[model samples]
Target: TEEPDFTALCQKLKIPDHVRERAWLTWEKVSSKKKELWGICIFIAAVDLDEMSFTFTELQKNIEISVHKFFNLLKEIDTSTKVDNAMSRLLKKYDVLFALFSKLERTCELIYLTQPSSSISTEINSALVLKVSWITFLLAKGEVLDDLVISFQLMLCVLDYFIKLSPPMLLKEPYKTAVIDTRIIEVLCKEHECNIDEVKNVYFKNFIPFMNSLLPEVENLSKRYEEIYLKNKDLDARLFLDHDKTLQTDSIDSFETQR
Candidate 1:
């Protein structure tokens, strides 16, 4: 693979070098440069693949599974005796999560208007499980600018997957492409009235610094899975450090297989 201008669309915008550096750090935690580059390639591939394809239902299904897997992994991490009482208490506090979780379902249906990111921030801020601690957890796990960026990009990849099943949005008069992701970040910011400068400053200061905090915990989590869950049951799996690469290849391969 070769280096392509990933930040090409933001030509006027200098994507901070720190963003790349953070991505590098994040990638080192779970992937090789080769793998990371491959993942980037795959992410680009998905954008092209999403052009004039898939139905909205299919895209929604993709994200639903991801959200489920993310929480299930959280539950697995807390299965020990030390935190059971606290964890149970914490889970109880999230009584409203079920309602929020269903939003993912609505998103799949294309019936739910996207809650403003500001509202999401309010919800996440109040969340016992999803609040500061998860941020702490992420920081502890070596999550870097690269990882966050990759996460943002792959989210689009998830949408692109379902674009195969979505009704196209008529942006002008004629609907073209997968009806998502032109100025997505801008739209999110505008819809939520987000402070772009605040986001920028926070991203620069706390983003990569937090990754250093999260590495040990993530490593421990990975070990726990390998030692406890994996040892007990044979599972076919591979660790993906560069999430973008794996999702891209997996997505295309999946489409190919289905075809």
Candidate 2:
């Protein structure tokens, strides 16, 4: 299959519109859904782990809620439903992991709504353990380009949404991933017996920079969500924007939500 370049892809798929408005709007709804999911996860984790409190669960729920709001402010500008199927298939390949992710999401929902202090939910703990083990499994499997991209995005969730959920540790070697296909390019070079240095310079050097560039915009989404939903304050419709200029004519309805 021929993948389109970033620029052409954006123009053809209307990625900018999704980024500025539509994607974020959907993300807001999805985050609300995640809140529902997290609420269940915490109750289940508490029942299973028998923790002393729901501190971590609550904190993690907050982070996820925040991120959900963050992305909800962007537009998912993919014109065709084909990309949806492709992404779904990609996620399905890691069904077990995603299933656990669903549970973890549910746990967040519990923590946010109740903010219970009568010890953590054991049932919620199971989801947390699953997350740890699942990520551990992926790391042990080694990092590839595609793997790296997924791992990187997951890492973002860990750092952004699960900050208090786990302890801080120094990440090294394999901990670094393609971050949207850096590893993929490395694999290509290795498969072709090419110069690794040249490959990195020519292809992967800008990977981190590219992601960094998106951070500010992503942060804006968080602000928007807090204003409109969490704080229950009026939101500036102009502020409710997307990067893409074109809007989708089709009814924008999708069930997929990231936790």
Candidate 3:
């Protein structure tokens, strides 16, 4: 029996060093069926993180092919007429992936609220400009919507983080295209109008206020900081006026001397 070197395999796959240990831990516990699903999940995450590149069309094609292949493999299973945990999970994973692809496709087509710069920040570089859509899709899916405020807060965090970046990040596409496409706010607004008292949880209470405050005016904090800085510079320069100290002192001395 040939034992594969896990470390060598991970290195060859270019998996990040930080996550390799956790990946090994998961690999040890999961059965072969789980391992295949886990590998697929890892592959998708890696592609998103820029560990590899796949265009939207390419991703759709590959995902369709994989789903077909998985369905065929399931058909070969011995005497299984029901969707078991593994098969159910496989279907759900594919559904999530398809939803993600749809969101990304929509986001990429948006006209960004901010114009593109000749140079973009290194820390914030990506092959696709729609990275936040991928993030919102992952978080907003599944049971996370039970506490819709979490999704609201998640969007706020993304918006705030982008607002604070060096060459400010424009989140209008993520907000308008991805987050809004989820129809979360519309649902929440309806619930609010309908007087759903249960919706006033801690997260909602806080999220509503912040969202309201920003809706009217979300001027860039970076630009505000610059305005304040420039104003302070003028104040600092003009705080005290310098006079001809020599003449003033001399005049005072002569007047004192005469007195």
Which candidate wins on lDDT? 3
Sorted on TM-score, best first, the list reads 3, 1, 2
Candidates in order have lDDT scores of 0.31, 0.32, 0.36
Predicted structure 2: lDDT: 0.32
- Predicted candidate 2 versus true structure: per-residue lDDT over 6-98, tens digit per residue: 223223322333242333343344446443333323322332333313322132333333212222222242223443443343333333333
Stretches of candidate 3 exceeding 4 Å from the true structure: 1-65, 79-83, 113-129, 136-259
What is candidate 3's lDDT per residue for 132-246, written digit by digit as tens? 3333323333213323334434443333333333132344433343342324333333522422343344235543344343321222432433344344221111111121121
Q: Of models 2 and 3, which has the larger lDDT?
A: 3
For residues 142-210, could you state the per-residue lDDT of candidate 1 as single tens digits? 334223433333222223233333344412212122255434333333533555555444444545354
Q: What is the lDDT of candidate 3?
A: 0.36
Better of 1 and 2 by TM-score: 1
Q: Name the best candidate (by TM-score).
A: 3
User: Please, what is the TM-score per model?
Assistant: 0.22, 0.19, 0.30
